Amino acid sequence: LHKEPATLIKAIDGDTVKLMYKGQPMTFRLLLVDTPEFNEKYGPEASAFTKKMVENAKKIEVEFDKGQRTDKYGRGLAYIYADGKGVNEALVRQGLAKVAYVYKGNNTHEQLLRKAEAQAKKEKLNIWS
Questions:
Q1: Which residues are catalytic?
Q2: Where is this region: Disordered?
């Protein structure tokens, strides 16, 4: 897998963000994580977490996995990094997302994410409290 540069346009919720990617705006859905929807418990906190992480980044990068690269709604399915730090793992490690089902072969960081989630859970942090 490789990282490509992107520019934040706007953070949308805990697991979706609008980026300028190759000179065009695109909605990205973060791979392998499910944050609560904004009107669910921890939904606002997950939204606020992702927003601060991407807005405060000097550099955003997107990294597609080896599977299907867009969902049926036109969203890019990727790992997103802010100054070299994965947003996906950060949310799971913070207990603000659960690890999602693998979608269409995009599984590269699945074990790493499960490990972060198991630690959040052991710490009864946020969603796990």
A1: 29, 37, 75
A2: 109-129
Q: What is the rounded (10 degree) CA torsion for 116, 117, 118, 119?
A: 50
Resolution (A): 1.9
Question: Phi and psi at residue 29, in whole multiples of 5°?
Answer: -105, 130
Structure determined by = X-ray
Instruction: Name the strand (E) or helix (H) holding 99.
Output: strand 98-99
CATH number for the region 1-129 comes to 2.40.50.90
Run of H or E residues at 64: strand 60-64
- What does the alpha-carbon distance between residue 50 and residue 96 come to, in Å, rounded to a whole number? 10
Tell me: is residue 65 an annotated ligand-binding position.
no
CA-based nearest residue to 50, from 18, 77, 6: 18
Angle at CA 119, nearest 5°, toward 48 and 15?
Answer: 30
Q: Which residues, in sequence order, are CB contacts of 84 under 8 Å at separation 6+?
A: 59
Q: How far apart are CA 44 and CA 74, in angstroms?
A: 24
> Is residue 83 a known part of a binding site?
no
